[PDB]
Amino acid sequence: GFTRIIKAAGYSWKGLRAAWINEAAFRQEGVAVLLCVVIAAWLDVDAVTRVLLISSVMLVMIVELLNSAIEAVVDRIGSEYHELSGRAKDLGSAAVLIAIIDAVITWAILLWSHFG
Amino acid sequence: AAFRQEGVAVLLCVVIAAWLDVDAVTRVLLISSVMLVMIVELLNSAIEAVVDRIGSEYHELSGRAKDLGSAAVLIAIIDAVITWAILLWSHFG
Amino acid sequence: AAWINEAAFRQEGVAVLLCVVIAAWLDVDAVTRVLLISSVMLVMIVELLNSAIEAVVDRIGSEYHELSGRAKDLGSAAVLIAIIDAVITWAILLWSHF
């Protein structure tokens, strides 16, 4: 049961590693998310505000990774132009963008509310 | 078609949240939970696009992929309903 | 349909379910309760999407491709981030609660 955990953790690290190595944009996003978590962790806010600040940027990373898994599947099927290939990447990018706008807005609402 | 009725769904939820006199935290939760449903539906549709891209022939793993996807959407929606029920109950408590 | 039978989902699902039951009984304010519940729901959502990705990969066939491994690894990383987010959420909110 905890043999599945080890194996799964190993796959997870490989995914993070590959995402980091292969694109500057993912590394820069990773920097942004880590800076936000650190800032949230040190900010003088209540616990529920702290969790909202942290979990909104975490969600960006989650959807980013899920969208990148979709892209890899699409690219696996081939370099071919295909209507559903394009559509699959369009839907997934849209998801990523919603998560990001949500994080940004969540941060602006709460920090403005905090007035600091 | 079934895409913009979802856009109306969320805009209506945003209008309600705006209209209700709740604090910033409550409003973020109300709206986030609806936006998660949207994120999950889009990721699900992406997966369905990929499945249909491989072939429109039936295959156990194709059915499996779509049903797991749709189960994800259902959980997100249950999560939204729970969120709205709990926060409104507390607001009007 | 046929996936809820398997040991892997049964185990993941029961953990999430227990956490929701516990969150429902805790003496916490409303916003705290919502965050405890949706953080573990999110783990279940992401696990379900990860498995959906795995199924599409396996659907393509058994021949290994670098990008097939990558899709599964990336899906697994998302699950890990959702789980860390759940643990952080419960720790921050219930630290305050004891």
Ligand SMILES: CCCCCCC/C=C\CCCCCC(=O)OC[C@@H](O)CO
């Ligand atoms: C509480 C925050 C949890 C983390 C959320 C954001 C995580 C973002 C990226 C994860 C780090 C991946 C690092 C992989 C890595 O450093 O390998 C690269 C190395 O081989 C050469 O630089």
Ligand SMILES: CCCCCCC/C=C\CCCCCC(=O)OC[C@@H](O)CO
């Ligand atoms: C693409 C944008 C990503 C940028 C990531 C880093 C920026 C994140 C948040 C911006 C606000 C940071 C400054 C807030 C702050 O440190 O105030 C602390 C102050 O209240 C303590 O007295």
Ligand SMILES: CCCCCCC/C=C\CCCCCC(=O)OC[C@@H](O)CO
């Ligand atoms: C306060 C510092 C950042 C806060 C979040 C903690 C870091 C979480 C994830 C980042 C991965 C830790 C760094 C691992 C690393 O350096 O990579 C080693 C890599 O070369 C091995 O292949």
Ligand SMILES: CCCCCCC/C=C\CCCCCC(=O)OC[C@@H](O)CO
């Ligand atoms: C991988 C990185 C782990 C993520 C780190 C998240 C840590 C989050 C918060 C740490 C500090 C919380 C602030 C302490 C605090 O709330 O003090 C107020 C409390 O003592 C009042 O009773």
Ligand SMILES: CCCCCCC/C=C\CCCCCC(=O)OC[C@@H](O)CO
């Ligand atoms: C101030 C007056 C505003 C009038 C519009 C109010 C908003 C009305 C309805 C919002 C739509 C949400 C419905 C989605 C829902 O709850 O579950 C849908 C799901 O069960 C079916 O797939």
Ligand SMILES: CCCCCCC/C=C\CCCCCC(=O)OC[C@@H](O)CO
């Ligand atoms: C306030 C309670 C939670 C609100 C849920 C937020 C998400 C809103 C709508 C999700 C489902 C909308 C209905 C569309 C759907 O999934 O079923 C198809 C059918 O209803 C035709 O559109």
Ligand SMILES: CCCCCCC/C=C\CCCCCC(=O)OC[C@H](O)CO
């Ligand atoms: C100071 C860090 C604060 C939070 C750390 C808590 C970490 C607790 C558990 C980490 C998760 C252990 C591995 C789980 C795992 O392998 O993921 C499942 C796969 O990724 C997909 O099925």
Ligand SMILES: CCCCCCC/C=C\CCCCCC(=O)OC[C@H](O)CO
């Ligand atoms: C990546 C897409 C980003 C989209 C633009 C982000 C919009 C930024 C702020 C809009 C916030 C709406 C009002 C929120 C509020 O009450 O105060 C916000 C503060 O005045 C600004 O820090």
Ligand SMILES: CCCCCCC/C=C\CCCCCC(=O)OC[C@H](O)CO
């Ligand atoms: C993760 C998504 C986060 C986005 C939700 C945060 C805010 C979203 C849209 C802004 C709508 C805010 C309306 C609140 C408002 O109208 O002001 C209340 C005043 O007291 C009366 O108008």
Ligand SMILES: CCCCCCC/C=C\CCCCCC(=O)OC[C@H](O)CO
């Ligand atoms: C999309 C979810 C829709 C769920 C609707 C739940 C009911 C919401 C509000 C009930 C309205 C009836 C009472 C209205 C009220 O007393 O105050 C309304 C305030 O004037 C708004 O600022």
Ligand SMILES: CCCCCCC/C=C\CCCCCC(=O)OC[C@H](O)CO
């Ligand atoms: C699906 C069947 C629908 C049945 C509708 C009738 C249900 C009657 C009452 C249910 C609402 C009770 C919620 C009250 C509650 O739990 O909140 C407590 C507050 O936090 C403190 O007042």
Ligand SMILES: CCCCCCC/C=C\CCCCCC(=O)OC[C@H](O)CO
């Ligand atoms: C079939 C059950 C009804 C499902 C929809 C509502 C259930 C939502 C949460 C389950 C119970 C956990 C909440 C208990 C509760 O309402 O406590 C009061 C809140 O803290 C404030 O509203």
Ligand SMILES: CCCCCCC/C=C\CCCCCC(=O)OC[C@H](O)CO
């Ligand atoms: C009391 C706070 C708990 C917060 C974290 C809730 C975790 C909920 C579910 C965790 C499920 C992790 C399993 C992930 C996975 O893919 O591996 C399955 C293995 O069988 C792990 O046992």
Ligand SMILES: CCCCCCC/C=C\CCCCCC(=O)OC[C@H](O)CO
């Ligand atoms: C999966 C088993 C391991 C679980 C480890 C849970 C705790 C480890 C890391 C949690 C990260 C946050 C620490 C708690 C914390 O920040 O409390 C500070 C304040 O007292 C709460 O706001």
